[PDB]
Amino acid sequence: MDAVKKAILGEVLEEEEAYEVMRALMAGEVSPVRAAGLLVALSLRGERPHEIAAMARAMREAARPLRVHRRPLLDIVGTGGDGKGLMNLSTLAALVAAAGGVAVAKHGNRAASSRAGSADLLEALGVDLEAPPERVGEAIEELGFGFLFARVFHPAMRHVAPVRAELGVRTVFNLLGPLTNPAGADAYVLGVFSPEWLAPMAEALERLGARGLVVHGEGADELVLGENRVVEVGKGAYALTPEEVGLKRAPLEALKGGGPEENAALARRLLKGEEKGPLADAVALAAGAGFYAAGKTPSLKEGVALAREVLASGEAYLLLERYVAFLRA
Amino acid sequence: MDAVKKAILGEVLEEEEAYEVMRALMAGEVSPVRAAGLLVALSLRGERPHEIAAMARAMREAARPLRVHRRPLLDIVGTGGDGKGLMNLSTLAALVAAAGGVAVAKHGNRAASSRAGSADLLEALGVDLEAPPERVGEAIEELGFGFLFARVFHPAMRHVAPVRAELGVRTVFNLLGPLTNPAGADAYVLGVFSPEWLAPMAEALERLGARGLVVHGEGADELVLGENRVVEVGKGAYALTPEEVGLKRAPLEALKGGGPEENAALARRLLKGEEKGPLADAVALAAGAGFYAAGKTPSLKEGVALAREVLASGEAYLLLERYVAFLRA
Numbered sequence: 001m002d003a004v005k006k007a008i009l010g011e012v013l014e015e016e017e018a019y020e021v022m023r024a025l026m027a028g029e030v031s032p033v034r035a036a037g038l039l040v041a042l043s044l045r046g047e048r049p050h051e052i053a054a055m056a057r058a059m060r061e062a063a064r065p066l067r068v069h070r071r072p073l074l075d076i077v078g079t080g081g082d083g084k085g086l087m088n089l090s091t092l093a094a095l096v097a098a099a100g101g102v103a104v105a106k107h108g109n110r111a112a113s114s115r116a117g118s119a120d121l122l123e124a125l126g127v128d129l130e131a132p133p134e135r136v137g138e139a140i141e142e143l144g145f146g147f148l149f150a151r152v153f154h155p156a157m158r159h160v161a162p163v164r165a166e167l168g169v170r171t172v173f174n175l176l177g178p179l180t181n182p183a184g185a186d187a188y189v190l191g192v193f194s195p196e197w198l199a200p201m202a203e204a205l206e207r208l209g210a211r212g213l214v215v216h217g218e219g220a221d222e223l224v225l226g227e228n229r230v231v232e233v234g235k236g237a238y239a240l241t242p243e244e245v246g247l248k249r250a251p252l253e254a255l256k257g258g259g260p261e262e263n264a265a266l267a268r269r270l271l272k273g274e275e276k277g278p279l280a281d282a283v284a285l286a287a288g289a290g291f292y293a294a295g296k297t298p299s300l301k302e303g304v305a306l307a308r309e310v311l312a313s314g315e316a317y318l319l320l321e322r323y324v325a326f327l328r329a
Numbered sequence: 330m331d332a333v334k335k336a337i338l339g340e341v342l343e344e345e346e347a348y349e350v351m352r353a354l355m356a357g358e359v360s361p362v363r364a365a366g367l368l369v370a371l372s373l374r375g376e377r378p379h380e381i382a383a384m385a386r387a388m389r390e391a392a393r394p395l396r397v398h399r400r401p402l403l404d405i406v407g408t409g410g411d412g413k414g415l416m417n418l419s420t421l422a423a424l425v426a427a428a429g430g431v432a433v434a435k436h437g438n439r440a441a442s443s444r445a446g447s448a449d450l451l452e453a454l455g456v457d458l459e460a461p462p463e464r465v466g467e468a469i470e471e472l473g474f475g476f477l478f479a480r481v482f483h484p485a486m487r488h489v490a491p492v493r494a495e496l497g498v499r500t501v502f503n504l505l506g507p508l509t510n511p512a513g514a515d516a517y518v519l520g521v522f523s524p525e526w527l528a529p530m531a532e533a534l535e536r537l538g539a540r541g542l543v544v545h546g547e548g549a550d551e552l553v554l555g556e557n558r559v560v561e562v563g564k565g566a567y568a569l570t571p572e573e574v575g576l577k578r579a580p581l582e583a584l585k586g587g588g589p590e591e592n593a594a595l596a597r598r599l600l601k602g603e604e605k606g607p608l609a610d611a612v613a614l615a616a617g618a619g620f621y622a623a624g625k626t627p628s629l630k631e632g633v634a635l636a637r638e639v640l641a642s643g644e645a646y647l648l649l650e651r652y653v654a655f656l657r658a
Contacts, residue, residue: 010373033365033495040366044339166362168334
């Protein structure tokens with residue numbers, strides 16, 4: 001029986017079938033009606049780690065090829081859809097990590113008509129999102145940082161997004177986004193929207209041959225200055241608080257930021273080491289987890305300590321401008 | 330929240346939320362993509378009786394209106410989709426019931442599966458399927474019989490038909506068909522494709538203020554000359570065998586039909602009272618369940634005895650002819 005019909009029927013898909021269904025979606029072989037039915041059936045059934053990993057493979061394989069030598073290669077990405085609208089700090093944590101000596105290939109996208117997306121912020125900072133995949137790869141090899149704009153690497157998403165937007169609910173694609181880095185990143189600080197996804201996503205990463213931390217910060221799909229929950233690949237689960245790594249707490253509101261126009265100005269002051277409020281602490285936290293995930297520092301605390309020093313030096317801003325100029329003719 | 334979204338999320342709808350969802354669909358306000366999604370979500374978590382009845386009322390409200398004064402008004406119909414291609418026994422049984430003095434408003438359509446649907450049979454017999462609704466209502470109150478062609482009464486279904494065919498699976502619409510009699514029939518012999526739908530559908534009919542039996546016969550969505558399962562509105566569940574109503578068993582193969590003309594040929598022999606084989610027994614069984622559901626006979630046994638006589642009298646054929654001509658008058 002057809003793999004898509006089987007999914008629509010709500011039956012659990014075997015690894016091969018799950019891969020086939022995603023391959024067809026990415027190949028533009030599934031009508032919107034069936035894509036819609038398929039996605040609803042999976043979100044209601046509860047996608048399993050083996051299905052998740054296999055579909056992740058189908059997606060990666062369908063993307064525009066790009067190979068990078070730099071290793072370890074870190075990515076600080078989230079599943080999105082936490083439903084809170086805080087300032088995406090992953091992008092800034094990525095720049096901090098790259099400035100700190102870790103090769104980074106940050107997977108990102110635009111905020112669905114919200115302008116609060118990583119892509120939106122970088123562009124506002126001077127990043128020409130039109131740069132071909134080859135040039136981005138070159139930036140990763142030479143500068144140690146690259147921003148992988150999902151539109152550029154995943155053509156089929158132009159046809160999937162409308163289906164997702166109309167369904168208006170979370171689907172398997174929220175999980176696959178972080179698991180489909182098109183540069184082959186192998187170290188992660190992957191945030192999820194609900195704690196129920198920490199364990200299964202950690203296994204998904206392990207299945208894909210990756211490592212790092214899967215995190216969740218009190219409802220948010222990113223580390224916050226509160227009672228974070230974490231799951232380490234190759235290790236287990238545990239809580240991570242600010243005080244534990246030398247940082248003090250602060251309400252989520254302190255990490256809300258503001259309008260897409262205001263976020264850009266903040267980013268600059270943050271990367272320069274000018275801004276030193278709760279935003280600078282949450283950036284250090286995620287960057288620290290990155291340093292640790294990629295093996296740059298032996299512990300999370302030393303990772304955060306490095307991130308604060310890097311952030312305070314302003315070198316992360318010099319890297320951003322270096323990258324901006326690198327993409328220009 | 331939005332009713333359609335709540336459905337897509339897999340949550341049980343409140344009755345009026347269910348009414349609202351179907352009203353939007355029939356009004357053509359739901360994109361085929363969100364429609365495909367809600368339909369899959371509903372079929373997967375299981376539709377409840379209160380939801381089914383509410384959606385049925387919504388659907389009835391969007392159909393071309395037709396009011397019939399004669400009561401009780403009997404309909405012998407099934408959910409269809411059982412894949413067996415049997416002769417159109419319910420249409421013949423409906424005519425036998427009408428020849429017995431019970432006002433009948435039989436709901437039906439052409440068989441897309443292949444051919445030889447209730448509408449196809451009657452068309453071959455000369456019924457003008459295009460006869461306006463107001464005309465069919467005149468026949469019902471004058472000749473006691475009428476065929477309600479779905480295509481003619483439910484133009485709004487064109488907004489949904491495409492999504493049902495594309496999904497390729499059963500949805501709530503397979504259940505609503507028999508619950509949307511355009512004439513407001515209140516007595517039923519309603520067949521379902523699977524036994525698990527007997528009780529929920531009986532409850533749905535009760536909520537709709539209707540009376541009668543919901544039946545299932547060894548895989549078939551109608552009464553067969555075998556071990557039948559029944560759930561009567563206001564009485565409960567029970568098995569129904571040919572023996573207890575004075576009939577003899579026989580295999581489904583004997584109830585097989587064929588093309589529209591062939592089916593029309595047999596229909597002529599049966600209604601004229603010339604063919605006394607298994608087909609005659611099956612027609613009597615259903616027509617008898619109809620007399621009983623409509624309150625014409627105090628029991629199924631008596632209804633079957635009356636049905637056998639009416640069929641053997643050839644009276645049902647005279648009625649048909651009176652029907653055809655009436656539509657051409």
